[PDB]
Amino acid sequence: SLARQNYHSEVEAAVNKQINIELYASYVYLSMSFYFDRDDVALPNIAKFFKEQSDEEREHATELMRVQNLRGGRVVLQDIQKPENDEWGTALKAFEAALALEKFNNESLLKLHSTAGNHNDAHLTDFIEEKYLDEQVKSINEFARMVANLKRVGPGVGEYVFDKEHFS
Amino acid sequence: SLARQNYHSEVEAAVNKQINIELYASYVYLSMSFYFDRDDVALPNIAKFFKEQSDEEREHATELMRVQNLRGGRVVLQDIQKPENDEWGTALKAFEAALALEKFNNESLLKLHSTAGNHNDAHLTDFIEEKYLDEQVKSINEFARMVANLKRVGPGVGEYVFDKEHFS
Amino acid sequence: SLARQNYHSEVEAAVNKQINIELYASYVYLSMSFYFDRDDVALPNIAKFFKEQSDEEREHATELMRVQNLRGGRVVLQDIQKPENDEWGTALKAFEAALALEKFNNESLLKLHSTAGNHNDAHLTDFIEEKYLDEQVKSINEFARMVANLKRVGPGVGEYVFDKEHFS
Amino acid sequence: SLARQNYHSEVEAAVNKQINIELYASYVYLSMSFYFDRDDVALPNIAKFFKEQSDEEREHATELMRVQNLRGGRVVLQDIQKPENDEWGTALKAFEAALALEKFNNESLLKLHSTAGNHNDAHLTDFIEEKYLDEQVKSINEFARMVANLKRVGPGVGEYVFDKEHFS
Amino acid sequence: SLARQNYHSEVEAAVNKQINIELYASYVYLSMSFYFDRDDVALPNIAKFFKEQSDEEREHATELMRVQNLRGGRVVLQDIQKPENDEWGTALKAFEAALALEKFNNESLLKLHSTAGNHNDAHLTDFIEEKYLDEQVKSINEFARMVANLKRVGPGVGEYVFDKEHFS
Amino acid sequence: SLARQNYHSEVEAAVNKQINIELYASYVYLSMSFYFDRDDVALPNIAKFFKEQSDEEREHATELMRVQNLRGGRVVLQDIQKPENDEWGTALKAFEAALALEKFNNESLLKLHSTAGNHNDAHLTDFIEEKYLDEQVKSINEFARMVANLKRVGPGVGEYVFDKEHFS
Ligand SMILES: [Fe+3]
Ligand SMILES: [Fe+3]
Ligand SMILES: [Fe+3]
Ligand SMILES: [Fe+3]
Ligand SMILES: [Fe+3]
Ligand SMILES: [Fe+3]
């Protein structure tokens, strides 16, 4: 690359690892979205919410691919593993699993930021701080509030009222 | 008929049978609609929904009459039997009976499609596949989702919330 | 019913009888509408007219069901008999049979009004007078004028001119 | 062709045969259109109708040429034979000859559909069913209704009234 | 499932297999899109085209998941394999590999249609014919035309002119 | 014909001959249009141009039929011969063959004008001069300019640039 400058190989490898992590999270959210679309579950606003989350994680992966091309590195793709479960239980269990996934993703992003800071890469630490860390903190807070409200309303008619009211 | 071509008599008889089946389904949905309009039941959005379903089944019967005239056959009408019940119980029992009626209608439509396929009638198999089979699959899925939500919300205030929220 | 007041059982039975009469008239007009849609008859404006008449008779039956629920009675449905003929001859014969059907319906409505008057039911006699008797008189007059014009124009080109001009 | 897949040579030959049949039908309708434009016949709306029918048959032939190029086959054109008659008699005789031509075309289309079904060509059977069979059934029904109305109105002033009224 | 009717398990397994095939094709097109985004390749309209193709294949996979839920089956997801190459050579080699991928996908779709036809599943054969087969034929034709034009213009300034002109 | 005046039979026969010549030219241009639509040729603007030329030649033939009916003659149609080639080579060879066809048509039109002038038919010589001769001269000039530009740009990328630029 004629454009490559102050971009070490360890940082390039860590960016490729984060790309695979974002693609796996997108595929997990797609699985959850079509679990709540089943005819014996039938909570359509929750399914639409998880479909939007899947699209957002795919956008995160493509923006990391774009900055990898911008700095003069090379994108190397790996296999995307299938999700851990085919069915996700009640709505409370699914939102708790989603919260755990968001926290795992936040820990991976902080490790990537630490590697880029150790190799004195100012542009990439600023990129990560501007586009990923604040969005991840807000996503974790949103899922924690939804878990608290699902614990409040309880099963049955509270779950129906939550599906009708929380996403409009 | 000057227009009749590749239209056997068995297919004509099966089309007349399907016309009577659609008219019976319309009259059953009219009975359900005015059961939920009673002053001691008083669920108006469910009653409006079943009135719309009755109008839709009448439209299905008239479109079958129109294609019978289009192919050069002759419409032969029979008696329309009264519905099996005068009162339909709770909302869950009524929607379960409606789901069973939709599945019976789907089985009759598949038998008509099989007869038209056995007599090498390409236009009528394409007509049935385009206008009836996909609509019937979507109707069965809609009634199954409504049965699942009525099992979720339970009786009483859940039934009131279902009547207020599900059809708007 | 908590709402029932000054509504005797004989009046309720007569209202159910009138409901079945209106549904039978709707099904007769549907048969006439699809007779004139045949490819060897081919008078489309007459067929559209009889389709509108069928929809109107269905509306009459549903309004009687609504007032039965309003007064606190219970709707009891019966079988709908098939029409007397499959084919209706010339246009003059069909309009004469339609005129005879309208006069039969008017005689049934007058008998219902007489029963409600004998049982001192002021609301139902006023309902019948405001919604059914004047409309029935106007319908009989319209069919008599159409029979007179069909006798005037004669068969053939007069029938074609009648179909093109009378309903626009 | 780099695009050819699951497209046998017998199906290609049958598509070329159907192209020639549609072009012949277009040229027959052009002959009828300019017969009714003569100064001793002078029925202008019938002539305009047959001109539109000629344009429609030319569109059918060009859409078959387009799907032949789409599947990777090669278009092979043949001579277009002249129509059987120079003059077409009365309006009733011309519309009866047009009805016979439409039924011949429908029989050829059903034979093409049968060949494509015997060679397990799913895309072409769906193409024929979607774009040609229903349109052909509707065209045959339209010509049969016009023959019935021309028999009704008779010669002379009925023919003039038919030309003035039926196409507006 | 309360909605499942005339839906055998072999057809369900074949639908899950086709879902995995569409997801793999989407990931291959994403790899091609970010190959042409590199700073030493720099053909931006080709990269935008392959990004749109990746989004379209993802939409195909989600519509198959939706019809699997509609018929009462259960979605079972598998691993998505990484693409065969990291870099795709010249533009002609990349479009030839894309054409081969589209033809492989068409062969898989025809096998799925054959299985659904062997198990007498009328709704699913009509669904596949309406939504997938014609689109696949048009996609194969589009890629074959692009391969022919890339062979015509040659390398260098012809490749630049192709990137500037073909997608606007 | 009541309208025929100063219209000899030789002029009528020459008009019928010119009608057949225009229809043959239309069918040749249709063959060229679908040659350039092939997936291994793929020059879409040239194909659209030849489709428009085919429609224009059909309009020329129908206007000659109209003036034949206007003067009180009778249209007599003949067979339309198939074109000389199924495939037309490069773009330069196809445009050279089109130029030769236009010059043949111009020679036939001048012979028709000479016959009408020899029989002292003032209206038809004015008709031919106003509607056919100037249009034919402009068409020959347009095809000669396109042959000169196709010789200028050469094969390959020049042919691609010609297809992209010359018709917009
Ligand atoms: Fe993310
Ligand atoms: Fe129905
Ligand atoms: Fe009435
Ligand atoms: Fe046609
Ligand atoms: Fe796809
Ligand atoms: Fe010309």
Expressed in Å, this structure's resolution amounts to 1.9
Among C22, C38, C56, the strongest candidate for a mutation testing the B interface, having the largest count of B CBs within 10 A, is: C38
CATH of domain E9-166: 1.20.1260.10
Nearest-angstrom CA–CA distance, B148 and A150: 19
Shortest Cα distance, chain C CAs vs residue B38, angstroms: 6
Nearest-angstrom CA–CA distance, A41 and F51: 56
Neighbour-count burial of E55, counting CB atoms closer than 10 A to its CB (0-12 exposed, 13-18 middle, 19+ buried): middle
Q: Can you tell me which residue has the tokens 């018709």?
A: F167
∠ Cα C136 C141 C147 (to 5°): 125
Cα B31 to its chain centre, rounded Å, is: 13
Task: Say how many CB pairs under 8 Å bridge E and F.
Answer: 29
Shortest Cα distance, chain E CAs vs residue D2, angstroms: 6
Chains F and D touch (3+ CB pairs under 8 A): yes
Set of chain D residues whose Cβ sits within 8 Å of the Cβ of E148: 2
Find the D23 Cα to ligand 6 centroid distance in Å.
19
F136 labelled ligand-binding: yes
Contact (CB, 8 A) for B90 and B155: yes
Set of chain B residues whose Cβ sits within 8 Å of the Cβ of E120: 114
Residues belonging to chain F: 168
Spatial neighbors of B131 by CB under 8 A, at least 6 apart, are: B63
Nearest-angstrom CA–CA distance, D38 and F73: 9
Set of chain A residues whose Cβ sits within 8 Å of the Cβ of E55: none
Q: Do F40 and E148 touch (CB under 8 A)?
A: yes
Chain F: list its partners (3+ Cβ pairs within 8 Å): D, E
Q: Write a three-state SS string for chain F.
A: CCCCCCCCHHHHHHHHHHHHHHHHHHHHHHHHHHHCCCCCCCCHHHHHHHHHHHHHHHHHHHHHHHHHHHCCCCCCCCCECCCCCCCCCCHHHHHHHHHHHHHHHHHHHHHHHHHHHHCCCHHHHHHHHHHHHHHHHHHHHHHHHHHHHHHHHCCCHHHHHHHHHCCC
Interface membership of D5 toward F (CB under 8 Å): no
Interface membership of A161 toward B (CB under 8 Å): yes
Nearest-angstrom CA–CA distance, A62 and F25: 55
Q: Can you tell me which residue has the tokens 């002038």?
A: F117
DSSP string, B37-93: TSTTT--HHHHHHHHHHHHHHHHHHHHHHHHHHHTT------PBPPPS-S---SHHH
Could you tell me which residues are beta bridge partners of residue C80? B80
Interface membership of A81 toward E (CB under 8 Å): yes
Find the F57 Cα to ligand 6 centroid distance in Å.
4
Helix (H) or strand (E) holding B107: helix B91-118
**Protein residues within 5 Å, CB atom, of ion ligand 6:** F 22, 57, 60
Q: Do B2 and D144 touch (CB under 8 A)?
A: yes
C18 labelled ligand-binding: no
Set of chain E residues whose Cβ sits within 8 Å of the Cβ of D127: 134
User: Measuring CA to CA, which residue among B163, B149, B165 is closest to residue A168?
Assistant: B165
Interface membership of D122 toward B (CB under 8 Å): no
Which residue of D lies nearest to F80 if distances are taken between CA atoms?
A: D80
Interface membership of D51 toward B (CB under 8 Å): no
Q: What single-letter DSSP state applies at residue E146? A: H
Residue C80, helix vs strand vs coil: strand
Interface membership of A93 toward E (CB under 8 Å): no
User: Measuring CA to CA, which residue among E153, E156, E144, E151 is closest to residue F161?
Assistant: E153
Contact (CB, 8 A) for C8 and C121: yes
Say which amino acid occupies C151: K
Interface membership of E81 toward B (CB under 8 Å): no
D105 labelled ligand-binding: yes
Q: Do A39 and B162 touch (CB under 8 A)?
A: no
Neighbour-count burial of C89, counting CB atoms closer than 10 A to its CB (0-12 exposed, 13-18 middle, 19+ buried): exposed
Domain boundaries, chain B: 9-166
Residues belonging to chain C: 168
Tokens found for residue A46? 């929750």
User: Measuring CA to CA, which residue among E74, E66, E79 is closest to residue E127?
Assistant: E66
DSSP string, chain A: --S--S--HHHHHHHHHHHHHHHHHHHHHHHHHHHTTSTTT--HHHHHHHHHHHHHHHHHHHHHHHHHHHTT------PBPPPS-S---SHHHHHHHHHHHHHHHHHHHHHHHHHHHHTT-HHHHHHHIIIIIHHHHHHHHHHHHHHHHHHHH-SSHHHHHHHHHTT-
Among D66, D119, D123, the strongest candidate for a mutation testing the E interface, having the largest count of E CBs within 10 A, is: D123
Find the C28 Cα to ligand 2 centroid distance in Å.
21
Which residue of B lies nearest to D109 if distances are taken between CA atoms?
A: B122
B81 labelled ligand-binding: no
Burial pattern B96-106, b for ≥16 Cβ within 10 A else e, equals: bbbbebbbebb
**Protein residues within 5 Å, CB atom, of ion ligand 1:** A 22, 57, 60
Nearest-angstrom CA–CA distance, B88 and B80: 20
Shortest Cα distance, chain D CAs vs residue B57, angstroms: 23
Q: Is F82 left (phi over 0), alpha (psi -120 to 50) or beta?
A: beta
A9-35 and A44-70 helices, crossing angle to 10°: 160
Chain B: list its partners (3+ Cβ pairs within 8 Å): A, C, D, E
Contact (CB, 8 A) for A146 and A49: no
H-state helical runs in chain C: 9-35, 44-70, 91-118, 122-128, 134-153, 157-165
Q: Do B38 and C69 touch (CB under 8 A)?
A: yes
Neighbour-count burial of F160, counting CB atoms closer than 10 A to its CB (0-12 exposed, 13-18 middle, 19+ buried): buried
A52 labelled ligand-binding: no
Chains F and E touch (3+ CB pairs under 8 A): yes
Nearest-angstrom CA–CA distance, C6 and F56: 82
Solved with: cryo-EM
Say which amino acid occupies A33: S
B102 labelled ligand-binding: yes
Tokens found for residue B96? 């379960």
Nearest-angstrom CA–CA distance, A74 and A72: 7
Query: Other CB atoms closer than 10 Å to residue F117's CB: what's the count?
Result: 13
Q: What are phi and psi of D80, to 5 degrees?
A: -100, 115
Nearest-angstrom CA–CA distance, C98 and C104: 10
Residues belonging to chain B: 168
Which residue of B lies nearest to E6 if distances are taken between CA atoms?
A: B107
Residue C137, helix vs strand vs coil: helix
Find the A101 Cα to ligand 1 centroid distance in Å.
10
What do you get for the CA distance between the two ends of chain A, in Å?
48
Contact (CB, 8 A) for A149 and A162: yes
CA atoms within 13 A on the CB side of D150: 16
Q: What single-letter DSSP state applies at residue C156? A: S
Which residue of A lies nearest to E42 if distances are taken between CA atoms?
A: A69
Interface membership of B60 toward D (CB under 8 Å): no
Q: What are phi and psi of E73, to 5 degrees?
A: -85, 180
